[PDB]
Amino acid sequence: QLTTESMPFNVAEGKEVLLLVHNLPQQLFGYSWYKGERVDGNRQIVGYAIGTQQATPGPANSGRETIYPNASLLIQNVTQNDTGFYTLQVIKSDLVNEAATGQFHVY
Amino acid sequence: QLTTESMPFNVAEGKEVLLLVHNLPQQLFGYSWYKGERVDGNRQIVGYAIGTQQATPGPANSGRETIYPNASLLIQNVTQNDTGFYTLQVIKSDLVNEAATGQFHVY
Ligand SMILES: CCCCCCCCO[C@@H]1O[C@H](CO)[C@@H](O)[C@H](O)[C@H]1O
Ligand SMILES: CCCCCCCCO[C@@H]1O[C@H](CO)[C@@H](O)[C@H](O)[C@H]1O
């Protein structure tokens, strides 16, 4: 089962957090991260294609995030606006996609 | 701007409806249709890989739908359960994705 978790879970303003990703499925094309609890184009942070290793920003991209080839997302110089939920959609080769939501809490 | 519309808009129970799709972006991996107004894995009707022209059913597939290469969705022998909103997500080759919602009304 695809899941994500934040390290750390409670994050001091101005520090760093890594969203770790567990149990990627076999046979995927790539990753799409979104701010909030659902898949929503208007809140897309980044898209990443695992075949070319290319990252492309979406409308909610801050410039402070880095995605890794295993879909883990690093956020640096974390702000109040970064707090709360994130949603990872994994795009499967058959287009029957999977999603996981995680969160962290800025203080 | 990606949009969809139903032909016909008001559809008699037991007849047929075609969801037409306008203004697909270029450079696409595939299409995913969902029942309702959002992208939600539990309500996915079909996923379609453009590279192979191959359709795979999701959990909401009824067996009465057919999807075409330009993302149009035909539904035959329409039921009451088919009424209302449908959402199409288009997966671009950069994994920055677009969605459009439409509806039809069964009587
Ligand atoms: C600056 C730190 C760079 C982070 C590099 C990628 C870290 C990813 O690390 C990987 O995380 C996966 C999800 O993250 C976990 O499932 C794995 O245990 C781990 O191998
Ligand atoms: C019974 C068989 C149904 C025919 C399925 C193919 C119909 C595809 O529908 C398409 O929607 C587009 C909207 O831009 C139009 O521009 C295309 O020309 C139209 O054919």
Author numbering:
A (entry chain A), B (entry chain B): 1 to 107
What did the article's authors report about this structure?
Human CEACAM1 (hCEACAM1) is a single pass type I transmembrane protein expressed as 12 alternatively spliced isoforms that all contain an N-terminal V set fold of the immunoglobulin superfamily (IgV) ectodomain followed by up to three type 2 constant immunoglobulin (IgC2) ectodomains (A1, B, A2), a transmembrane sequence, and a signaling cytoplasmic domain. CEACAM1 function is triggered by intercellular or trans binding of the IgV domain, resulting in higher order surface CEACAM1 oligomerization and subsequent intracellular signal transduction. In contrast to other immunoreceptors such as the T cell inhibitory and mucin domain-containing protein 3 (TIM-3), programmed cell death protein 1 (PD-1), and programmed death-ligand 1 (PD-L1), CEACAM1 serves as its own primary ligand, owing to high affinity homophilic interactions of its unique IgV domain, as well as an important microbial receptor. The displaced CC′ loop forms a cleft with the FG loop that exposes the key residues F29, S32, Y34, V39, G41, Q44, Q89, I91, N97, and E99 critical in mediating homophilic CEACAM1 interactions.
The E99A mutant structure revealed a GFCC′ face-mediated homodimer structure globally similar to the WT homodimer but with localized conformational differences resulting in a C-alpha root mean square deviation (RMSD) of 0.3 Å (over 1539 atoms). In addition, the distance between two opposing hydrophobic valine (V39) residues was slightly higher in the E99A homodimer (3.9 Å) compared to WT (3.7 Å). Similarly, we observed a CSS score of 0.63 for the E99A mutant, which demonstrated the presence of a slightly weakened GFCC′ face dimer. The I91A IgV domain adopts a GFCC′-mediated homodimer with RMSD of 0.6 Å (over 1489 atoms) compared to the WT homodimer with fewer hydrogen bonded (12 vs 17 for I99A and WT, respectively) and weaker hydrophobic interactions (specially for residue F29).
